[PDB]
Amino acid sequence: PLMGGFGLKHPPPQILIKNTPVPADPPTTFSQAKLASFITQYSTGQVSVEIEWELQKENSKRWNPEIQYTSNYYKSTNVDFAVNTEGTYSEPRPIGTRYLTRNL
Amino acid sequence: GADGVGSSSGNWHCDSTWLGDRVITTSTRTWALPTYNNHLYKQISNGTSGGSTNDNTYFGYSTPWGYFDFNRFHCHFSPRDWQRLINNNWGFRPKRLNFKLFNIQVKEVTQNEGTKTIANNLTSTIQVFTDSEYQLPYVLGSAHQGCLPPFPADVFMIPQYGYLTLNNGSQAVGRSSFYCLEYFPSQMLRTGNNFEFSYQFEDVPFHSSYAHSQSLDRLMNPLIDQYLYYLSRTQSTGGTQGTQQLLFSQAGPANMSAQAKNWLPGPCYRQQRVSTTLSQNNNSNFAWTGATKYHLNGRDSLVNPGVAMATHKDDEERFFPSSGVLMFGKQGAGRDNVDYSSVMLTSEEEIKTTNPVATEQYGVVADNLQQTNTGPIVGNVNSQGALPGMVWQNRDVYLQGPIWAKIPHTDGNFHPSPLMGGFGLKHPPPQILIKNTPVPADPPTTFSQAKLASFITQYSTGQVSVEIEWELQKENSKRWNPEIQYTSNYYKSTNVDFAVNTEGTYSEPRPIGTRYLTRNL
Amino acid sequence: YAHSQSLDRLMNPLIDQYLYYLSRTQSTGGTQGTQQLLFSQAGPANMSAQAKNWLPGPCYRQQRVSTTLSQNNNSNFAWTGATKYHLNGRDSLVNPGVAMATHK
């Protein structure tokens, strides 16, 4: 992909879900038309997903230290990647995936 | 059991599997069953004492019961899956069907001032039974409304069940039959339970989908003559005197009309002809008056459609018989006195080969018996019965049309097959009947002889699923050039056909005939 | 046995049909008789126009006779106006004929 990530020829299927429509009380006398009324409705539940990942271990002889992604040492108003006063979770900056080095 | 309220009693199957020749098609819809007749049986009638005439008199009952009607094709075939059927196949017939109710939930409702409020009633039940002994009037096959809506998102209302019986005028005779449906074994269902049964269609002929490539009179060999002779000329020709003489000839390529032919066109029962162009039709109302009718028990009944007959001959598109063709509506078309634009007109053109044109005479026969002094006179046969040596084609079926009908059980019938098309059956699929189990309101403390006149307003809803295993007759043919196929327009349009519109109203633009592929007669 | 349902009454009294028939050939309710094709559905109101799947049995007419003497004509039509079939020059009266309802 241009956005990055993995291209796949058989991606994970997409799950589709809908409330089963519940019609309100239809009239007594038959009517040809389809039922235009329904009971306002919504549903809630829990969903769980796991992904088993495979890693390629980093095996390298570079003498000096590498570069690593690390949180700031210095004080700040409030913790990054954590909630704020009013409870709004916030992530300050994007995280690149490339730090460790490899000989071309 | 292991069902209970917390668990759902079924799944949702809408699918079509093409397995070799067999093709399994299933469907599912959401249904809602209103209480009918405040749980009463009612004698209903229409007397001619009112504006009604003697033809419209009926006598009958309207029961609280209601019945699932799946009888129409468009229930069981998605238009694409109905395309694969008519493009690739000569013929098809059903074999066995299966039927399921499930996820039944019952509800009640109360009216408190203007507040209209619904709740669930867990214990309340509904009753379900099929007639497998055919002990009831079988009212499917008259193409009444209310069949499972084509587009599976729709939710439909189960139609009320009633029937008609003998009358004399508005009153009834001694043979008038009554039926109390609660008098049959039925199953009572609770929101946990489901209902299922399996049916098997009786042996039935493949419905022919194809158009003969050879008109019935053209079976000859173009090149070769015949060894038979016919009477070409009664009068000595090329002389000043008209002396009569019998001369004979052979019918070759030159004159093909006189050739001896081994078969006859199908039977013919005339219709009146009508043009879509208004100026061409007469100025009058001949609709009912000049209509083609049959007289029964003093009640003149219009013949709709009538026997299967070619709609219009070659190089006239516009003329169609009065009642001869099935006529559907466009989506959202009015009920009564709606203009021509809203109705759709099926056409018989496929069968023009083997059957006579509907609006034209079948044949000509001699009226008189000739003599020296008597000139021969020949009359028209407007209606011609069946004679030995006649072949014909039954009426085509359409995506909207009915699938079957119940052959009446009588001692003598000639080639049963419905006029609407479809399959005739001597043991059709049973009809399912269903009703809310009536729940009485609080009766008084002191005993009362009278039956309980109050009930809790109620309705129920659930899911229904039906599958039909079909058998196909594969199309095996050597025709060199391409066939004709049913295909959607290539050119752009406001919006897709057979698909929803802006406001969400599903619509089907035109009927779909079953006959494209060709077969050598 | 005697069928409890006359052949034209097989319908459902309550429900309409989805087929249409030709109700009226002429624009109605105007001073001018301009012809117009209007269509309708046959419901409970008009049951005669409904599309029916079968036909009455075959028919070969007979002459009608009343037991009341005054009502019948004054003549001998017995043999003369009889319903006959012609075979090999010998006209043979049809007795009884095909099974047909005696009187309406």
TrEMBL record, chain A:
Annotated family: Belongs to the parvoviridae capsid protein family.
Superkingdom as given in the UniProt entry: Viruses
Cellular location(s): Virion
Species name: Adeno-associated virus
Protein name, UniProt field: Capsid protein VP1
